[PDB]
């Protein structure tokens, strides 16, 4: 069974998801079996109060490309119980991508996938362009 999963606390926790990135954000909930599930997206520069539970696990991605994002400067967010009527903030931001990953993002945004192998670049980069970011491989790396 996967180690990265939400705890079934059944204890409500109100969280403000703050999109402090220029990307449309996809919140991803890791369920009780450690499987990722998509939730409604957040436009850039918007904050929204949402209803979750203590010990639940969340990660955040670019909704269109699945590029990884940070939450409170780390990969995973776990709501805690609210104290003195205060919401918990999940501040979502861009990571400092490596230059290579940022270049791959830009090339993927400009060239259709069937045309990657027509680019005048070293062949090893075709596999890198095709190896699109995905939650499954990131969970494996984090585990």
């Amino acid at each position: 069974r996967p180690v990265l999963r939400s705890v079934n606390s059944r204890e409500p926790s109100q969280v403000i998801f703050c999109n402090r990135s220029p990307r449309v954000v996809l919140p991803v909930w890791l369920n009780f079996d450690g499987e990722p599930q998509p939730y409604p997206t957040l436009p850039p520069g918007t904050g929204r109060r949402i209803h979750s539970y203590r010990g639940h696990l969340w990660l955040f991605r670019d909704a269109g490309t699945h590029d990884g994002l940070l939450v409170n400067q780390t990969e995973l967010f776990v709501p805690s119980l609210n104290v003195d009527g205060q919401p918990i903030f999940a501040n979502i931001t861009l990571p400092v991508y490596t230059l290579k990953e940022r270049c791959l993002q830009v090339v993927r945004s400009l060239v259709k996938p069937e045309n990657y192998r027509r680019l005048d670049i070293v062949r090893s980069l075709y596999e890198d362009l095709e190896d699109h970011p995905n939650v499954q491989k990131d969970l494996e790396r984090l585990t």
Partner: protein
């Protein structure tokens, strides 16, 4: 403490040593005159952009502030990707 990174077309880029050490390849090249590295296949319009990346990485790594996007114009994207692949940064 500065290093000089020289493009294929002879432009000399003077950057902080700690910023250049972002690249594992440059770290290996430094360990060419002392504190200087020549790049036979990286032209100046690309190497200048790599130096901007080093400044950006050092400024925003471990920062608690809102990080801006690192911009890449379409016309330099392929050459910058080749440089980043070679430089491992």
């Amino acid at each position: 403490m500065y290093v000089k990174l020289i493009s294929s077309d002879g432009h000399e880029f003077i950057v902080k040593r700690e910023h250049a050490l972002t690249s594992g390849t440059i770290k290996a090249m430094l360990s060419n005159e002392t504190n200087e590295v020549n790049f036979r296949e990286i032209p100046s319009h690309v190497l200048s952009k790599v130096c901007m990346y080093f400044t950006y990485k050092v400024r925003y790594t471990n920062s608690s502030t809102e990080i801006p996007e690192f911009p890449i114009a379409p016309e330099i994207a392929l050459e910058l990707l080749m440089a980043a692949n070679f430089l491992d940064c």
